């Protein structure tokens, strides 16, 4: 938020962190690191020629799998 960004994708990342803070109040740095990592991997996938929408759909599939796995390995306090 304090960062004087001009790039619109960086503005989207600022919005991402702000959203994590609004909903949760923690994770505001994890969300950004993870999104950057996902895009960095999509970079190689696009180099290999996959459609960015196919990449996004594979990401949705894997995200659903990871969310259910979190519900699975979770503990209660």
């Amino acid at each position: 938020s304090m960062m004087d960004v001009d790039h619109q994708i960086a503005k989207l990342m600022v919005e991402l962190s702000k959203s994590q803070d609004d909903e949760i109040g923690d994770g505001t740095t994890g969300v950004v690191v993870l999104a950057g990592a996902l895009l960095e991997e999509a970079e190689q996938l696009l180099d290999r020629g996959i459609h960015p929408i196919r990449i996004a759909d594979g990401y949705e599939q894997a995200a659903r799998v990871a969310i259910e796995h979190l519900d699975k390995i979770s503990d209660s306090v």
């Binding site: 180099d47 290999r48 020629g49």
Partner: protein, 518 residues
């Protein structure tokens, strides 16, 4: 907790170099393969250049980043050593660096990456040599197929049927196939003349000159005796300061007359040898061909071509058996060259050429006349013909042949993945990176062909694992096949040199940690 690494500029510099290199690789990825297209480059001066050659493209685009400059030098080195592969080498280098990115991120040291890359390079040279098959220079079909493969990528590929046999004849005419270990492409002269079409390119066994004939009326000579003249046919002139002081009117008439007589004696000593074609070297500091000399030569029925350059002399002698004469005393019949014809041929109002065809001593020299409708297409035809000649030169150097269509890259990728699984450690990650990085050339071939790169490369990997090591991307069928049936072959030297030079350039760039502005 080891050493904090208080400095981040080395890593920033590494990433900047990798980014620049990958940018160059990704910029020229489209000029790779038979389905690859050309780039137009307008220089700052406005000199236009259409080309498919990686070395040409990189040299012509005034790259500014240091790593990109180094890739330019890499492509030039590949052009020297093999003359073919100047795009594959840059793409391989860019890909190796783009993989070094994630390796560095994992936290591997550039020195470990460099050593593991050297290991992968040695194993890959082994693998490519195992894939290779020997070749006999007598295998004219193999030579034709190598040349056709080299030309498939260029604008002159519909003319491959014409320019591959010429590219094989030229080299096979300028080398002793039994003893030759290399070839000097300066033995092959290329003459770009506008006009006609690329289907008009020709292989002249004799000599071709752009210099004009000085005689009017004598354009054609049969049973031609040719002499090279490194002395001047004009009034005598000592190398020292010389004057002719006249003090009486008679000495004037005497001066004119004695000059006439000097010139006439010269041209008579020339005629007496049987010479009917006269090549005069270019002469500054003195008139090499005075009007009197031209008059006398024409009256004696001698064709005269002056302004021959002092750098074409060794070529002209090698070609038409002439011996250069620098003193009239040594101008005799044994210092001439016998040619069955010497003619000034016209090219459909698009200029004139002096063709000395037929030779009693045609010594290991040939000329290729490149025709064309545009300056750009002529220049690119010349470059492509040079690539074909250089492929034949690689075949002469190393009598070994490798399949094409990304078959060596896929086999390399596969066997180095296996090697990586066997060399467990932190070198395993780097060798696996080397393998997946070289797996990018097939991906490029597929993308440019118009296929699904992932599916195509997966099918290629699968068939090479099954055992079809001569399997590649058939842009004619649209998928995978045995590439030798499409006759896509290239010298082992090309792939080997590309790998070696790319690995060395990558290690050099990995040993860099700072940039200064001197």
């Amino acid at each position: 907790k080891g050493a904090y690494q208080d400095r981040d500029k080395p890593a920033q510099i590494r990433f900047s170099n990798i980014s620049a290199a990958k940018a160059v690789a990704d910029a020229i990825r489209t000029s790779l393969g038979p389905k690859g297209m050309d780039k137009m480059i307008q220089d700052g001066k406005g000199d236009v250049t259409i080309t498919n050659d990686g070395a040409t493209i990189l040299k012509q685009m005034q790259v500014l980043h240091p790593a990109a400059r180094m890739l330019v030098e890499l492509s030039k080195a590949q052009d020297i050593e093999a003359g073919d592969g100047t795009t594959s080498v840059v793409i391989i280098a860019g890909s190796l660096l783009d993989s070094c990115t994630k390796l560095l991120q994992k936290g591997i040291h550039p020195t470990i990456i460099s050593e593991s890359f050297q290991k992968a390079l040695e194993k890959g040279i082994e693998i490519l040599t195992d894939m290779s098959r020997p070749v006999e220079l007598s295998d004219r079909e193999t030579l034709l197929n190598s040349a056709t493969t080299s030309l498939n990528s260029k604008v002159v590929s519909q003319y491959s049927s014409l320019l591959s046999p010429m590219s094989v004849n030229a080299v096979m005419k300028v080398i002793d196939p039994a003893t030759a270990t290399s070839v000097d492409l300066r033995d092959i002269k290329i003459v770009k003349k506008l006009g006609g079409t690329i289907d008009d390119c020709e292989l002249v066994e004799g000599l071709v000159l752009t210099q004009k004939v000085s005689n009017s009326g004598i354009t054609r000579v049969e049973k031609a005796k040719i002499g090279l003249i490194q002395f001047c046919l004009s009034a005598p002139k000592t190398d020292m300061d010389n004057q002719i002081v006249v003090s009486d009117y008679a000495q004037m008439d005497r001066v004119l007359r004695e000059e006439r007589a000097y010139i006439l004696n010269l041209v008579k000593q020339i005629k007496k040898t049987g010479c009917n074609v006269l090549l005069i070297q270019k002469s500054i500091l003195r008139d090499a061909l005075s009007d009197l000399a031209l008059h006398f030569l024409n009256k004696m029925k001698i064709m005269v071509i002056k302004d021959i350059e002092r750098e074409d002399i060794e070529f002209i002698c090698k070609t038409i058996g002439t011996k250069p004469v620098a003193h009239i005393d040594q101008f005799t019949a044994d210092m001439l060259g016998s040619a069955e014809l010497a003619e000034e041929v016209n090219l459909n109002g698009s200029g004139k050429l002096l063709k000395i065809t037929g030779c009693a001593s045609p010594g290991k020299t040939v000329t290729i006349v490149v025709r064309g409708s545009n300056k750009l297409v002529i220049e690119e035809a010349e470059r492509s013909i040079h690539d074909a000649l250089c492929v034949i030169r690689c075949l002469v150097k190393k009598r070994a042949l490798i399949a094409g269509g990304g078959a060596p890259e896929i086999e390399l990728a596969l066997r180095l993945t296996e090697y990586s699984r066997t060399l467990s450690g932190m070198e395993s990650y780097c060798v696996r990176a080397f393998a997946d990085a070289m797996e990018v050339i097939p991906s490029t071939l597929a993308e440019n062909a118009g296929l699904n790169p992932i599916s195509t490369v997966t099918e290629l990997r699968n068939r090479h694992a099954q055992g079809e090591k001569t399997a590649g991307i058939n842009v004619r069928k649209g998928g995978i096949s045995n590439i030798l049936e499409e006759l896509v072959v290239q010298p082992l030297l090309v792939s080997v040199s590309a790998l070696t030079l790319a690995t060395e350039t990558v290690r050099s760039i990995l040993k860099i940690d700072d940039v200064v502005n001197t």
